[PDB]
């Protein structure tokens, strides 16, 4: 119903908080399995092989069988540690985006909630606006019952009556789709929700803009994430340089072999050479290798990981201009939002007393009923400008606080405290 | 010209019926090559090797040369069955979306055909609207030829005349880009196309909404496709468990070797050891391997494909709310569509006789010619939006029928039967 | 400030000429490392192995430290050559895209420049339109100070006055976001920019349309890029058939081993066999292998790069209809741009003298001040449509000429010479 509970009814029932929770727990499980090649390895083998000779080798035969246990452990790696560093940068990026999944969750779930309530309230001034068109249409037709005016005012109020019928029909459809927004993110139908107390509405002034360069350049998730990808490109420089490294190896392998004998050249002149033994063997191993001449494959990957480093530096420049653009664009959205809201209050008041002055001008007949529906219509327009711009002001609150990246569930909770009384969803 | 034949022109010359047909034949051809590693493998080998010795090998020399023939066969795999049924669930995903390429083909080619008809007919009422502004403009200027009215009526209707000139200009460009719907999608041009019999139109009432929960959840391609990816993820759990499995191996080979002899310590005190033989060899092979200790990537992708199992479960939840959203949103689109059609029919009536009583109201002079052009313009809005209420209702027909997944070339054919008389595609 | 210098201040400061030049130098550096497997490859090895027996084999022990020098060279490949010429189709398609990055960067730096100019000019027309609303509003209120008019034009002009306040507020915001377009792309702030000398602006007639099928089908980067992807797919057909090729291989190695001895059953009846001195060894090798029976993986990839052959062939059909769509759509955008501009100039003249004859009709009182603000409003609409349609005209020059792919820094310079005097950003 109200905000944070629907957030609860989103935080349990967002398929992308559960999908993305599956992403981040898959990413930390991915840290676990990226750690998994660091372990030793153990396995068994066995084989059977027949032999036969010819071409100055015919007459001697054999069959051979063996088994072997093998456990290995590396005596050099930086790459699993490297891919563990890129692994933790990557799952840390997944936590950055996952904070953008709770941040996006509150952002578009609360935003979508404001679209639901927005379709309720714009649909509501559509309703009362239709009521005004039907009152002046109705009393106009009543003046036609004695025969005062030509029918085209009645039928222009009928055609525009069909227009506001299309507005409550299609805006009714927009609220149906808004029920598919709470049914898209939340999943269900709520017959009423928490509306807005428009009475205590105030003009909160935002932060200084270069202070928001500090808030953005300190508190962005995105170019932080470009530092993770960019330093990750430095780890790809050093990972090609892991491509330049020598190595040592540890292995272990026991095994058995019998290798029975057969053939014409085998039996005869054997002399204890061809007697059957029961061979058992225990083995250990090491292996050094050095990169003498790779052919220069590394120092191409170094340069291209520098190209990812400076390109990702241009993703901190892209993200720099982008979230500079977010807090400054959003900043001016708050500015023209607030000042435009002041114009909406004076437009509502001047449209109200001007509406009543059109009631005066129509009571004396200097202006027709057309201007009555123009100050009426324009009045309801300014009603949706002010109230809907309160919703867009709420979106502006999500622009500043979500642009901060520190939008918690308590900013979400305070915006739940901004709410008020429940209003139904499907009237007639 | 008519619908389905252009669909035939789509079914021959959609580059994604052809290219995506090639994608689905790439998927089934990929079932063939996904089956291909299961087959035995036969190949050749040959090598030349020289030896030279020093320091306990100084004076003994040799060289080596061998040939070989190798056919192998696996005596375990289950992963190629899930390469193969990844390949068949996912080839069936390509058939899901390729049935959504005929469904998308009819969808956006018939939709785009309705955009061509939309540009022709909205542009046509733009033409006749310009004719109305030119009859009252020309008639008003004709009454100015004796000097009845003010010139600002003639020049306001010259600015509005330039406006409807601009509307037939850029809506002429929408006809040009509609020729780029026929030419972007169909590839070609028609001088005229089969329009809509708008005169016999009726309001069909759609299905019950929960019957479309059963019907939509019955014949969705998308979350069926998520079940393909999702049981696919279940055998990625069980394909990490294919990594948990032991194995047996079959190989086969044969070869020849000569190994001529040379050197100072070689010849002398040989004693039949260094006589030349020309060894021939036949070999078979089997190999077992045992998952004794595998580092713990074991069971990790079990967990991560549980995050893909719940992942595609939230893609069947996302797809669930998405196609519930599609047929319910589309349902309300048909509702406000039909009721809006009623609104525009009453707008045709009320704007019609209201326009005629503005001809009366202007013949008496109580209203100016401005209101005549406004009820005229509004009447053409009831024309373009009753006719485009029919056209968006045709899009609504593709919203229900394409949202069902039941759409075929016979629903396509029935919408070709809905067509009528051809109207030209380049008038003046 | 003036155009191409901003481009200069965008060419050094494009994150995607730096990013994407880093991509293309990554592609050329990837020609280098794509050549690096073709090089002879040299490296070192060293290892050590202990022996111990049991089960009728107990009592034998030995050890050997081997070092090895290994240089290899292939005596068949076409794949690294086709990786290298897929690296020339990748560096060459990457050059197609990077010419589309200079091309697209000029396209959107000049486009975005026109958007900044658009926000400035529409903002200024909002300014002077507000000035007209305040002159007639103020004069109207002063006529109420003697008592001539009704207050509903004063307060409806306060609703419209607050409206144009909200329009210089939100168009002030479009200015601010346009500063975030110069700060999004240029990255910085400019105090003023080059306004257009609109006085010498004239219409230029475009090229013949089938001649633009020659210029487009000759001078597309995109379906050229589909040709490179397409012959790329032709030697993916024949790179599968490179998978059908037999092959020969050259290897080289040497090194030492030590092979000392220990044990209980080792010692006893040695006879010069168990004397310790440390071996040296030299080796080479070859490998010729033939696709005798491979399971038929190839001839599926052949058909699927026929599916990629019709992939990029129906991307040359998709790209064909797309750039036919680009220059025909853009062509008719030039046409409706020109004729619409002519309608805008006649809207300027007819709305101007119509506005003056509404000043006559209001000075005599036959029409109210509402029509004065409608011809005023519509006049400023002809201003914004006119100069903004000059931005539509020049942006159509970017559409057709960037559609030719020969839109260069000199067409950038030509439109830089189309500029004139600078106007600042932020007055009151």
Residue numbers in the entry:
A (entry chain C), B (entry chain A), C (entry chain B): 1 to 428
Article, verbatim:
Drug efflux pumps play important roles in intrinsic or acquired drug resistance to a wide variety of currently available antimicrobial agents. AcrAB-TolC is a RND-based tripartite efflux pump, comprised of the outer membrane protein TolC, the periplasmic membrane fusion protein AcrA, and the inner membrane transporter AcrB, which cycles through three different conformational states during the drug transport process: access (L), binding (T) and extrusion (O). A small peptide, AcrZ, has been identified that modifies the activity of AcrB. In this study, we report the near-atomic resolution cryoEM structures of the AcrAB-TolC pump captured in both resting and drug transport states.
The structure of disulfide-bond stabilized AcrAB-TolC pump with closed channel at 6.5 Å resolution. We also have developed a new procedure to stabilize the full pump using disulphide-linkages that were chosen from the proximity of residues S273 in the β-barrel domain of AcrA and S258 in the β-hairpin motif of the DN subdomain of AcrB seen in the cryo-EM structure of the full pump. The full pump assembly, stabilized through the disulfide-bond linked AcrAB, was imaged in the absence of ligand. The reconstruction of the apo pump at 6.5 Å resolution revealed TolC to be in the closed conformational state, like that seen in the crystal structure of the isolated protein. The periplasmic component of the pump, AcrA, forms a hexamer through the trimerization of two conformationally distinct protomers. A gap is present at the interfaces between adjacent AcrA dimer pairs, so that the AcrA helical hairpin, lipoyl and β-barrel domains do not pack tightly to seal the channel from the periplasm. This gap must be closed in the transport process to prevent leakage of substrates into the periplasm. In the ‘closed state’ conformation, seen in the apo pump, the constriction is maintained by an inter-protomer hydrogen-bonding network, involving R367 in one subunit and T152, D153 and Y362 in the adjacent subunit. The quasi six-fold symmetry of the interface between AcrA helical hairpin and open-state TolC reduces to three-fold symmetry in the apo-form. We propose that the apo-form of the pump with a closed TolC represents a resting state, while the pump assemblies with opened TolC in the presence of transportable ligands represent transport states, in which the AcrB trimer adopts asymmetric LLT, LTT or LTO conformations.
